[PDB]
Structure formats: structure tokens, C-alpha cells
């Protein structure tokens, strides 16, 4: 059926929820180390890596574009989408990402 | 330089290893759901709920091939990887996932 309709989306939303919830569970029984080689492959686990950095360095704010470009590997595309998600986060999320990422 | 080097092998490690740490922490925090929501794209979290669902319907046993295919949308190539990995899951992962799935 259509990818794109109420009921797919409350599915999806459902599915994405047991996820969050498994691996919450993992984490309380030191599973999440396993359970995220099983659920990510080796190149999403890089990116991820690779986005806590950007999410960093614009959240410092020191480094312009070529700079970021040539540390991380991420073009503008990529930089202008992360600082995109940065802009739509919720403030609570973010102070807390400037306290543990920046101090 | 070259992404198939040694130190660049320590690197990636380091990264992932603070994500996973990062991770814990806004879970801690009740944060875990904006931190993945801006860490992941929604086709990113679509791809991990399924995956959730075929990794359960693997360890159970009871559908088929064609029969996940129709009922995820996963090709046999997919399916394929996903028996891969939980092949080569640890005992204490696969014994866990089959406790709280089934
Ligand atoms: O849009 C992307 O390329 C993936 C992505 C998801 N969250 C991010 C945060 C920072 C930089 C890139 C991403
Ligand atoms: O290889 C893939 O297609 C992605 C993938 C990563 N972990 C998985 C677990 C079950 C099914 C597919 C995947």
C-alpha cells in the first residue's frame, strides 16, 4: 500500500517507538554495544560518529565552511542539513548538547 | 587521506564510541528522543523500526521468505544481511533479543 497515509505513518511511528524502547532496554542490561553492531551497519555507525562531530563544531561555532568540509568530510549539503535539524531541536536538547559536548 | 588505514580505524572508533556514549547519556537525560531524532533521518529511523521487526520474525521462524518480503517490504537481499548478523551476534545479544521480542 501508500507509504503515505495516517495509518502508515502511526505504523512507522510505532515500529520507530519499539526500537527507542529495545534499545533503552539494552542499555539497562549492557546490551547496547551488540545491539547497535546488530541494528546499524559499520558505515551508519560512522556517520553517526561523524554527525556528534558536526553537531559539535557548529554548536562552537570556530570552524567556517572549507574548514569543516576538509576535517570532517562532510560537504555543505551535509553541513547546511545538520545546522537545518540544529535550528528545528528542541531548547532543552540543545543547551544540554552545548553543556556535555562543549565543556 | 585513506579511510583503510590503521589510525583512521582508531578514529572511527573513538567517534562511535562517543555517540554510544552521548546516546546514554540523553537516555539518562529523557532526551534520547530529540538526540535521535536530529541524529538520525526519518528514513534512517523508519529502516531501524523494520529492522526491529525482522530481526523478531528471524528468531521466530515462522514466516517465510516472500512472506516477509510482502509483509515489510524487504527484498531477499536484506533479509539475507539480517539472518547474516544475527548469525554473528554474540549468544548473550541473541538470547536477550529472543527473551524480550518473543
Ligand atoms: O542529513 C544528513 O546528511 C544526515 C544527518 C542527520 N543528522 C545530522 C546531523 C549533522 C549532520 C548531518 C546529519
Ligand atoms: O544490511 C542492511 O540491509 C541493513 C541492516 C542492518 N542491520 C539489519 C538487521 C536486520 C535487517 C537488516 C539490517
Redesign the interface.
Known sequence: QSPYSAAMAEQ?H???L???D?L????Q?D??????????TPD???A??????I?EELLRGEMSQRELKNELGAGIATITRGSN??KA??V??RQ??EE??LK
Not at 24 to 27: E, F, R, V
Not at 32 to 40: C, E, K
Not at 48 to 53: A, Y
Open positions: 512507522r510505532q515500529e520507530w519499539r526500537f527507542v529495545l533503552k532496554n539494552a542499555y542490561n546490551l547496547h554495544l551488540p545491539l547497535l553492531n546488530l541494528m546499524l551508519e555507525r560512522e553517526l560518529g561523524t554527525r556528534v562531530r553537531v535539524y540544529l531541536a528542541p532543552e536538547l544540554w548538547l556535555v559536548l
